[PDB]
């Protein structure tokens, strides 16, 4: 209503516009570095998960690892993966949930709080790495006793393209399941070492990465979209408040001027 009201509530939106715009380009560079980190993850999946495709490994209490991130301001990344885990957890209500990222721990803590036994923090700043992947995977084995569940499921977001993403699930098979797979014999594995045991702990770490890298790239492409739409909409308010200002500024001056003219007749 007043010039001061309009000057300070325009200014703040001029900032948000400049700001949300900066993080549209911030998370554009961050997309180039996370398309190469994605491809190197996805290419590596075909090579690792091919053995299982050929050995024909299938399943026979459940650990659910859910992956989004710590950050917000990224469309509906966290909201529609939590939506997936819920439709899944509806069928199997008796499962232990491990969360990677706070924005999915909260989404889930409000819906099935007691199923969550572990949370991973500080997760979506840089790209994901095998070190985070493996050290998350190591605690999984240690504190959750990962190696022992009949079924282990990673929930994550697959980048369909640049402009969208798909909430996806994948299984991890333990040592027992690998060994006792229909076409395991096709491969001449030396049964001395624990090739299945190692193959499991490696694939726990490895396919988590596969998931994190995609979810993360799904996110970086939801963030540069939500911010793209934010700048486009913040600029719409700057159009309203530029005009209202140019108005309220003139009105102020005219009304002080009427006061002055009245005071100057008498």
């Amino acid at each position: 209503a007043t010039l001061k009201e309009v000057e300070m509530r325009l200014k703040s939106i001029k900032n948000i516009e400049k700001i949300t715009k900066t993080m549209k380009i911030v998370a554009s560079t961050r997309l180039s570095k996370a398309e190469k980190a994605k491809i190197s993850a996805k290419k590596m999946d075909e090579a690792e998960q091919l053995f299982y495709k050929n050995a024909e490994t299938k399943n026979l209490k459940e650990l659910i690892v859910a992956i989004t991130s710590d950050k917000g301001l990224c469309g509906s990344i966290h909201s529609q993966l939590a939506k997936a885990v819920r439709r899944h957890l509806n069928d199997q209500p008796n499962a232990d949930i491990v969360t990677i990222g706070d924005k999915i721990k909260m989404q889930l803590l409000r819906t099935h709080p007691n199923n969550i036994k572990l949370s991973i923090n500080g997760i979506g700043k840089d790209a994901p790495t095998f070190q985070e992947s493996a050290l998350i995977a190591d605690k999984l084995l240690s504190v959750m006793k990962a190696g022992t569940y009949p079924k282990i499921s990673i929930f994550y977001n697959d980048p369909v393209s640049s402009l969208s993403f798909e909430p996806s699930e994948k299984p991890i098979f333990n040592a027992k399941t690998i060994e006792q797979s229909p076409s395991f014999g096709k491969f001449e594995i030396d049964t001395d070492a624990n090739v299945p045991r190692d193959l499991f702990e490696y694939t726990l770490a490895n396919q988590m990465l596969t998931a994190m890298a995609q979810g993360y790239a799904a996110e970086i492409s939801a963030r540069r979209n939500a911010m793209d739409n934010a700048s486009k909409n913040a600029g719409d308010m700057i159009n309203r408040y530029s005009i209202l200002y140019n108005r309220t500024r003139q009105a102020v001056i005219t009304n002080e001027l009427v006061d002055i003219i009245t005071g100057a007749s008498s």
């Binding site: 991973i120 493996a134 050290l135 190591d138 605690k139 084995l141 504190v143 045991r197 702990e201 726990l204």
Partner: protein
């Protein structure tokens, strides 16, 4: 110690002059990751990974 964590420590000798060591090598090496255990709302202290 576990086959993943075991190959990782091996991935940090081969990672740690500063030549054949681009920016993302010393960023493959750093983790801002803190694991919080949870029971019935939270339970115990958040520890470094």
């Amino acid at each position: 110690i576990s086959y993943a964590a075991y190959l990782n420590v091996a991935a940090q000798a081969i990672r740690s002059k500063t030549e054949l060591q681009t920016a993302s090598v010393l960023n493959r090496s750093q983790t801002d990751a803190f694991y919080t255990q949870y029971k019935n709302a939270s339970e115990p202290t958040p520890i470094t990974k």
